[PDB]
Design a protein around this ligand. Structure first.
Ligand code: 5F7
Length: 319
């Protein structure tokens, strides 16, 4: 009692047991199967031609025979296409959203175990987070010279999105908490598997368990060109310690966060020379300022710039 979907690129088939798993009250593997077939048909026009027109309209998700017929119709169409071609790019944003949801659904089987009541829960990543990360990727424009680090990466969703979208040398996710770090290990395996199934390319990435405030992570942060950090719930000790880590970054180093690390209107004077604002520019980025119909949300871009401090010293010596 199982359903199989052949890979469009000839990777191992996707195998689902019957009864099909339920993800939540309105989401299940039956809808994941249908949407997977629709995405494959969308980015292979010959498949849309080969597949019989009625198959994706008349289905019963609660009938094994109906779900098996649908799966077999898609599989036969994949075979006809593999016969035609007989005689890896980055995923589109739409496909990437589907891949990340699918990776989460196969990985995080018990979402209760996360103990996350915040609007930044991994359970609701596809809601606003995905769109805001997509907006962030278009705004910061990373290259092969960049190293991306998500400090407090949860189950690794931001890392997986950024690695699928950009050409950074490497993407890192560091998570301290045991439950999301263990789930991140499954997210990693499922992501690599599904990306191979779709025939999609991603950059190199590593999801690791660790404390980003440790001695080891001090030099690592200093050598990072792009830091992503959801610092919304951080206490003053973690905030203070992080600012010390950032103070060792290179000129042009960037930090993307949910709360600014320095005031947006920082003005250097003799009484605030210790403040992180003396060595970084800070800008508020908002998709409502940047065709956005989502949440009225903002994020913050910090850029290491020691000329802020230099100009202050030059202005004292050269009035
Ligand atoms: C449900 O999502 C959100 C709700 C409210 N505000 C938000 C602020 C930022 C954000 N993201 C994805 C993010 C970015 Cl793009 C850069 C750095 C840090 C973060 Cl957490 C998500 C938000």
């Amino acid at each position: 009692l199982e359903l199989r979907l052949k890979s469009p690129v000839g990777a191992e088939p996707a195998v689902y047991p019957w009864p099909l798993p339920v993800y939540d009250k309105h989401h299940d593997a039956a809808h994941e199967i249908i949407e997977t077939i629709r995405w494959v048909c969308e980015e292979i026009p010959d498949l849309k031609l080969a597949m019989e027109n009625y198959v994706l309209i008349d289905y019963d998700t609660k009938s094994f025979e109906s779900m098996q017929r649908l799966c077999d119709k898609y599989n036969r169409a994949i075979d006809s296409i593999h016969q035609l071609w007989k005689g890896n790019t980055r995923p589109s944003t739409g496909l990437l959203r589907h891949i990340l949801q699918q990776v989460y659904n196969h990985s995080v089987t018990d979402p209760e175990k996360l103990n996350n009541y915040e609007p930044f829960s991994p359970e609701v990543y596809g809601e606003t987070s995905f769109d805001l990360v997509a907006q962030m990727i278009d705004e910061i424009k990373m290259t092969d010279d960049d190293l991306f680090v998500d400090l407090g990466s949860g189950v690794g969703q931001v890392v997986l999105q950024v690695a699928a979208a950009t050409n950074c040398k490497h993407h890192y996710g560091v998570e301290k908490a045991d439950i999301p770090a263990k789930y991140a290990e499954t997210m990693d395996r499922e992501f690599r598997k599904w990306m191979k199934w779709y025939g999609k390319k991603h950059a190199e990435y590593t999801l690791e368990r660790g404390d980003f405030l440790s001695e080891e992570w001090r030099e690592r942060i200093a050598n990072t060109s792009v830091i992503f950090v959801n610092n919304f719930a951080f206490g003053p000790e973690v905030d203070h310690q992080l600012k010390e880590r950032f103070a060792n970054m290179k000129e042009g180093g960037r930090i993307v966060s949910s709360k600014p690390f320095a005031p947006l209107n920082f003005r250097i004077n003799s009484r605030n020379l210790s403040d992180i604002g003396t060595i970084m520019r800070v800008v508020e980025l908002s998709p409502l300022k940047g065709s956005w119909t989502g949440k009225p949300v903002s994020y913050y871009l910090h850029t290491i710039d020691r000329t802020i401090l230099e100009n202050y010293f030059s202005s004292l010596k050269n009035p």
